[PDB]
């Protein structure tokens, strides 16, 4: 019944489920292009209706949680993801089974896909439900701020371990590919996700029962351009954490799933470089200049990436992907600058209004992005999203530089 015991358990429990989510969410675009090879539109349209279906059901779900005990909301959300991942695997096995019949001409296939995406909605919806029940003020209201700052120091390390490790572990397991079934690797990662959910439910439920009353029983116009220049970066496809690029690298580039996993894992590593560079430039150039020098550094590294992207050789793909990793240092740096600049220009009172406006602009860019992806002719035409991405980054510089004159 020691605090350190409770801490280590929750950490290990999070280690499994965070790796489970990261692995599963990384192999989804892969499984969508073995059922629909050459057709990236499916992957984009899948994520498009998942994003829309989640947004339209977010305020609808809030009314059925606002007056319910946290110990039940956890019971719902966690197991809601469990049955949504399971339903995802079922629809996946059927879609591959129907195409291999086959089988794509029937309207039966379209039904399975809509159902599949609907399942993807429930998984993300159940994820939100679990997050709200666990809340934001529940962690500080449970532990002293001195023992929490030590605890939060471990979370960053563990979340880093999953963001770097799980995509590599996923790409290896997904690369199973036996004679039958060819999606056995996907099913294992899906099972990985399920097994990692049952300690999550218990560890999050036991912490509620342990602390009954400690937590709650129930559950500027010129500042717009600063938001915009950050929201324009949500229009880009050039990211190791991006799903569209991962599908293009697996279908057209025909790169091994494991190296694509490594490529994603190395993305979080360059993110750490920003945690040293961005603070350095702040004390040396200024907060505003550091943001510009990071956003500018992002736009100049992505410029090289597109240049190498036009060559199309075994060496050019190495430079292309490499510059994308190098661009992360600038992105993560500018993204931090985005947050702190708002923390210095907006009081703690009306900070809630700002965060919501950003959640409207950035999400719009997300919808716009996958909408463009849903209008693609083929995976080969994904290149047109690459040039748009760089333009979105270069213009994001223009918008920020214009705003920086203040
Ligand atoms: C909402 C219901 C609209 C009816 C059919 C949509 C089917 C969409 C077909 C998508 C299948 C993609 C392959
Ligand atoms: K999990
Ligand atoms: Zn201490
Ligand atoms: Zn493969």
From Swiss-Prot:
Q: Name one GO cellular component term.
A: plasma membrane
> What is the protein's name according to its record?
Ferreportin
Q: What is the lineage of its organism?
A: Bacteria, Pseudomonadati, Bdellovibrionota, Bdellovibrionia, Bdellovibrionales
Q: Which residues lie on this side of the membrane: Cytoplasmic?
A: 1-5, 67-69, 143-144, 285-286, 346-350
Q: Which residues lie on this side of the membrane: Extracellular?
A: 36-39, 101-106, 174-183, 252-256, 310-315, 376-378
Role noted for this protein: Iron transpoter that exports Fe(2+) from the cell. Also binds to Co(2+) and Ni(2+). May act as a multivalent divalent metal transporter. The transporter is composed of 12 transmembrane (TM) helices organized into N-terminal (TM1-6) and C-terminal (TM7-12) domains. The substrate-binding site is formed at the interface of the two domains and is alternately accessible from either side of the membrane. The transport cycle is viewed as a series of ligand-induced conformational changes that include open outward and open inward states.
Q: Which family does it belong to?
A: Belongs to the ferroportin (FP) (TC 2.A.100) family.
Q: What is the effect of changing residue 200 to A?
A: Complete loss of calcium binding
Q: Where does this protein hold Ca(2+)?
A: 21, 81, 193, 200
Q: Which UniProt keywords apply?
A: Cell membrane, Membrane, Metal-binding, Transmembrane, Transmembrane helix, Transport, Zinc
UniProt cofactor note? The cofactor facilitates a conformational change critical to the transport cycle. The binding of Ca2+ from extracellular fluid activates the transporter by triggering a conformational change that enables the transition from the open outward to open inward states.
Which residue ranges does UniProt annotate as crossing the membrane? Answer: 6-35, 40-66, 70-100, 107-142, 145-173, 184-210, 223-251, 257-284, 287-309, 316-345, 351-375, 379-404
Q: Per its UniProt entry, which superkingdom is the organism in?
A: Bacteria
Record's bilayer topology term:
Multi-pass membrane protein
Q: Which InterPro entries match?
A: Ferroportin-1, MFS_trans_sf
According to the record, the signal peptide region is: none
The organism encoding this protein is Bdellovibrio bacteriovorus (strain ATCC 15356 / DSM 50701 / NCIMB 9529 / HD100)
Which cofactors are named for this entry? Answer: Ca(2+)
Q: Which GO terms describe its molecular function?
A: iron ion transmembrane transporter activity; metal ion binding
- Subcellular localization, as worded in the UniProt entry: Cell membrane
């Amino acid at each position: 019944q020691s605090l350190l015991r409770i801490e280590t358990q929750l950490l290990l429990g999070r280690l499994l489920t965070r790796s489970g989510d990261q692995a599963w969410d990384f192999v989804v675009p892969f499984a969508l292009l073995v059922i629909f090879p050459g057709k990236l539109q499916v992957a984009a349209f899948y994520y498009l209706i998942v994003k829309i279906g989640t947004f339209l059901l977010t305020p609808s779900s809030g009314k059925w949680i606002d007056t319910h005990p946290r110990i039940q909301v956890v019971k719902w959300g966690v197991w809601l993801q469990f049955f949504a991942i399971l339903a995802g695997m079922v629809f996946f096995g059927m879609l591959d089974g129907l195409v291999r019949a086959g089988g794509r001409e029937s309207w039966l296939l379209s039904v399975l896909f809509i159902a599949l995406a609907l399942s993807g909605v429930m998984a993300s919806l159940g994820s939100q439900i679990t997050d709200i029940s666990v809340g934001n003020d529940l962690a500080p209201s449970l532990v002293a701020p001195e023992k929490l700052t030590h605890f939060n120091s471990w979370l960053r390390r563990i979340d880093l371990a999953t963001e770097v490790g799980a995509p590599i572990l996923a790409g290896a397991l997904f690369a199973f590919h036996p004679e039958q079934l060819p999606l056995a690797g996907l099913f294992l990662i899906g099972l990985w996700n399920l097994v990692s959910f049952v300690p999550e439910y218990f560890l999050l439920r036991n912490v509620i029962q342990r602390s009954g009353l400690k937590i709650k029983v129930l559950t500027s116009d010129p500042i717009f351009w600063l938001i915009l220049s950050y929201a324009l970066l949500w229009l880009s496809v050039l990211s190791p954490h991006g799903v569209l690029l991962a599908a293009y690298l697996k279908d057209e580039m025909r790169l091994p799933e494991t190296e694509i996993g490594l490529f994603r894992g190395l993305g979080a590593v360059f993110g750490l470089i920003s945690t040293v560079s961005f603070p350095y430039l702040v004390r040396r150039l200024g907060l505003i200049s550091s943001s510009r020098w990071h956003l500018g550094f992002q736009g100049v590294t992505l410029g090289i990436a597109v240049t190498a992207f036009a060559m199309g050789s075994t060496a050019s793909v190495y430079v292309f992907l490499g510059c994308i990793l190098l661009s992360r240092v600038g992105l993560y740096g500018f993204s931090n600058g985005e947050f702190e600049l708002r923390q210095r220009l907006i009081p703690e009172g009306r900070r809630g209004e700002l965060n919501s406006l950003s959640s409207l602009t950035t999400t719009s860019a997300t919808l716009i992005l996958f909408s463009a992806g849903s209008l693609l002719p083929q995976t080969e035409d994904f290149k047109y999203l690459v040039y748009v991405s760089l333009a979105a980054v270069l213009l994001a510089n223009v918008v920020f530089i214009k705003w920086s004159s203040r």
